[PDB]
Amino acid sequence: KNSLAYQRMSWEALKKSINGLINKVNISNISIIIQELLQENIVRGRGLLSRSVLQAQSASPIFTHVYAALVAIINSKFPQIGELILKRLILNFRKGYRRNDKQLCLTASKFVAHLINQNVAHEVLCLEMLTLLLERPTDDSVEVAIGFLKECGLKLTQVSPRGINAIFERLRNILHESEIDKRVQYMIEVMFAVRKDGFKDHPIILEGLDLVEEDDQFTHMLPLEDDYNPEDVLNVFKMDPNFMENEEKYKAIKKEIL
């Protein structure tokens, strides 16, 4: 009926607008595109919003930073959405890894490293990722750890240098005491280069990717081997009997959060 047709038109047009904004989010418009993704209720379709976020982090290895600053902007207020994004990236990383999918594992590790640098993903989960990649390091898994580290070596080494020491020692052992080739040799060499350079070629977050205050953010820890769930079925809409009440709630919350 009229309420159902209104809900369907809302779902459709809002989803199209939110997808356009997620692919439109820039660095010179991170705050502006964040306020535009907020002006429409990003929480009504939080499943589909985090799905657009995951798509941005996956399909573009070069815009994972923008999706990351957006995830931080949206999680420092609503940690549940960025939390779903973290669960989805954990699912995608475990999928790429467990199924030997180089590209998907690499993209999901890109999103997770961007999260660990944006201070939305904890150090124990990054430790678990680096350890599972370096458990039986081959060219592929060691290089995956190397790509993760080329971006997230600042967060782990500045928050908990124990991670840096463990990473360096384990790398030295598994790449100097096992039948590893010039591939893993040069991956370890790139690792040592990034380390000794003091992480100047890749900071935690470039200008515009981390602007939230010290404790005014949200760093939730959902693990890799913990039985997380994607909860992305919400990317398909659903009828709402209380669309009016919940809509007033979301609109007033958007007013109180801007």
Partner 1 sequence: PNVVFIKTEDPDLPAFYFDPLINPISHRHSVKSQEPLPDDDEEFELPEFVEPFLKD
**C-alpha distances in Å from residue 225, one per residue of 24, 87, 132, 144:** 34, 11, 10, 18
Amino acid at residue number 120: V
Site stretch for partner 1 (CB under 8 A), options 39-47, 100-108, 185-193, 219-227: 185-193
- Least separation, in Å, of the C-beta of 230 and partner 1? 38
The reply on whether position 146 binds partner 1 by CB under 8 A is no
Closer by beta carbon to partner 1, 82 or else 137? 137
User: 151: left (phi > 0), else alpha (psi -120 to 50), else beta?
Assistant: alpha
Closer by beta carbon to partner 1, 99 or else 182? 182
Q: Which of 12, 135, 139, 189 binds partner 1 (CB under 8 A)?
A: 189
Structure-token pair, residue 179: 């039948």
The reply on whether position 201 binds partner 1 by CB under 8 A is no
Say if residues 194 and 150 touch (Cβ distance below 8 Å): yes
- Per DSSP, 131 falls in state H
The reply on whether position 196 binds partner 1 by CB under 8 A is yes
User: Cα(104)–Cα(110) distance, rounded to whole angstroms?
Assistant: 10
Q: Which of 24, 195, 202, 254 binds partner 1 (CB under 8 A)?
A: 195
Q: Considering only CA atoms, which of 140, 182, 181, 149 is closest in space to residue 168?
A: 149
Beta bridge partners of 121: 220
The reply on whether position 166 binds partner 1 by CB under 8 A is no
Q: Considering only CA atoms, which of 113, 154, 107 is closest in space to residue 130?
A: 113
Q: Which of 2, 62, 177, 200 binds partner 1 (CB under 8 A)?
A: 177
Site stretch for partner 1 (CB under 8 A), options 50-58, 108-116, 187-195, 232-240: 187-195
What does the per-residue mask of binding to partner 1 show for 23-62, with x meaning CB under 8 A? Answer: ----------------------------------------
Structure-token pair, residue 4: 């159902």
Residue partners of 48: CB distance under 8 A and separation at least 6: 15, 18, 234, 235
The reply on whether position 185 binds partner 1 by CB under 8 A is yes
The reply on whether position 150 binds partner 1 by CB under 8 A is no
- Least separation, in Å, of the C-beta of 106 and partner 1? 23
Q: Which of 172, 183, 249, 251 binds partner 1 (CB under 8 A)?
A: 172
Q: Which of 80, 159, 168, 202 binds partner 1 (CB under 8 A)?
A: 168
**C-alpha distances in Å from residue 198, one per residue of 36, 155, 194:** 37, 12, 7
The reply on whether position 145 binds partner 1 by CB under 8 A is no
User: Cα(116)–Cα(114) distance, rounded to whole angstroms?
Assistant: 6
Q: Name the residues that contact partner 1, by CB under 8 A.
A: 161, 165, 168, 171-172, 175-177, 179-181, 185-186, 188-189, 191-192, 195-196
